[PDB]
Amino acid sequence: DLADRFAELERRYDARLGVYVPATGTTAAIEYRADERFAFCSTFKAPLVAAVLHQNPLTHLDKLITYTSDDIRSISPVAQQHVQTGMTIGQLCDAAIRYSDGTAANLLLADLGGPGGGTAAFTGYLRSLGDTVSRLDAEEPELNRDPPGDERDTTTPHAIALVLQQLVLGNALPPDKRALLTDWMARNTTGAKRIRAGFPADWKVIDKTGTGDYGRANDIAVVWSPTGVPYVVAVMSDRAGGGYDAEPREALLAEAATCVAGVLA
Numbered sequence: 344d345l346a347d348r349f350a351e352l353e354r355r356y357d358a359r360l361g362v363y364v365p366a367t368g369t370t371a372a373i374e375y376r377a378d379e380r381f382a383f384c385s386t387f388k389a390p391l392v393a394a395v396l397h398q399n400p401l402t403h404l405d406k407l408i409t410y411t412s413d414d415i416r417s418i419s420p421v422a423q424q425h426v427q428t429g430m431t432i433g434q435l436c437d438a439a440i441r442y443s444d445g446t447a448a449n450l451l452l453a454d455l456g457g458p459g460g461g462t463a464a465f466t467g468y469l470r471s472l473g474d475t476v477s478r479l480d481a482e483e484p485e486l487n488r489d490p491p492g493d494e495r496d497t498t499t500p501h502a503i504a505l506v507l508q509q510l511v512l513g514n515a516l517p518p519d520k521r522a523l524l525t526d527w528m529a530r531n532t533t534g535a536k537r538i539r540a541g542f543p544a545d546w547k548v549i550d551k552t553g554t555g556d557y558g559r560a561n562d563i564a565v566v567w568s569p570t571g572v573p574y575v576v577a578v579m580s581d582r583a584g585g586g587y588d589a590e591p592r593e594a595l596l597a598e599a600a601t602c603v604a605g606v607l608a
């Protein structure tokens with residue numbers, strides 16, 4: 344039984360674990376704490392980019408965005424460099440997904456616009472996809488810091504997996520926008536030790552990671568079998584037992600994915 348295996352992992356890492364894989368043709372949904380809330384962390388950045396793509400003509404990608412020193416207030420491996428030149432929307436999407444740049448994310452939030460620096464429009468984008476559970480309330484760095492249990496800035500394995508399914512595999516976006524999102528996620532640089540480590544090499548994996556305080560570590564993926572059958576995999580965890588400075592534990596997500604890969608194979 345999968346639930347027995349997920350529970351052992353929780354004991355091993357002193358963690359809380361959530362897992363969701365929607366049903367397909369022939370496979371039942373895999374669910375474990377799938378409706379408990381977990382911090383989004385950097386994982387909102389995948390549907391944030393979709394929201395931005397959806398809202399604008401493709402050539403909006405070429406629009407140059409300028410920003411300064413006081414706009415850098417979280418891990419931002421790409422944006423820290425180009426504060427002189429500015430960055431285009433396309434570059435910002437690229438960094439937000441592949442590098443989980445937080446400044447890219449804040450700037451895309453502002454591009455989307457409206458109250459909460461764009462956090463209301465982000466959340467309404469999710470509503471339009473039938474997700475009535477997720478909420479974004481703060482931008483970077485504040486969104487990774489809410490105490491354990493607190494509903495702000497949370498989604499559920501169940502909710503984000505249905506979002507991601509619509510985004511990459513359904514018709515939420517037109518195909519040309521769909522392919523852009525899909526390809527940034529394919530080229531992600533931060534997930535090697537997460538869902539990716541759980542599936543064999545001949546499976547395609549695309550993903551968006553997240554990491555936060557209280558030992559938070561997440562990964563949302565779409566994976567394709569060697570014969571091209573897709574599944575959506577959402578893994579979320581935290582370790583409230585360590586307190587604010589608990590270490591996230593990637594190996595936890597890689598072990599849970601392997602458990603899921605052995606079922607799906």
Ligand SMILES: *C(=O)N1C[C@H](NOS(=O)(=O)O)CC[C@H]1C(N)=O
Binds near residue numbers: 484
């Ligand atoms: C996202 O969750 N974050 C932004 C940045 N990169 O995401 S990743 O850790 O999953 O690769 C650093 C960690 C985190 C954050 N604390 O903002």
